[PDB]
Design a protein around this ligand. Structure first.
Ligand SMILES: *[C@@H]1O[C@H](CO)[C@@H](O)[C@H](O)[C@H]1NC(C)=O
Lengths: 45, 43
């Protein structure tokens, strides 16, 4: 006998529920946050 | 802050929580309370 899980899932009929690196300062680097992307010079304000 | 007994002034509000549920709601009531300073304990 086998543990066979029928893996069904709700897909896009609802807002989604089933969904890091180090901080580098003062360099012209690419970045990407939780939601927002970009390329600049990361600083501390 | 008490000036004369009434709510008026410049107010600012902020988000607290979100629930990504995805349904509609078209009605509401409010669960009230009763206390005396409601058949036996008034409001
Ligand atoms: C949206 O709102 C209406 C109005 O109450 C409701 O009948 C309906 O079930 C809701 N949901 C959808 C998916 O239309």
């Amino acid at each position: 006998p086998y543990r066979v899980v029928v893996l069904s899932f709700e897909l896009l009929h609802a807002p989604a529920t089933v969904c890091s690196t180090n901080l580098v300062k003062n360099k012209c680097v690419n970045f990407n946050f939780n939601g927002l992307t970009g390329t600049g010079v990361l600083t501390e304000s | 802050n008490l000036v004369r007994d009434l709510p008026q002034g410049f107010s600012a509000l902020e988000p607290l929580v979100d629930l990504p549920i995805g349904i509609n709601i078209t009605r509401f009531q409010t669960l009230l309370a009763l206390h005396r300073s409601s058949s036996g304990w008034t409001a």
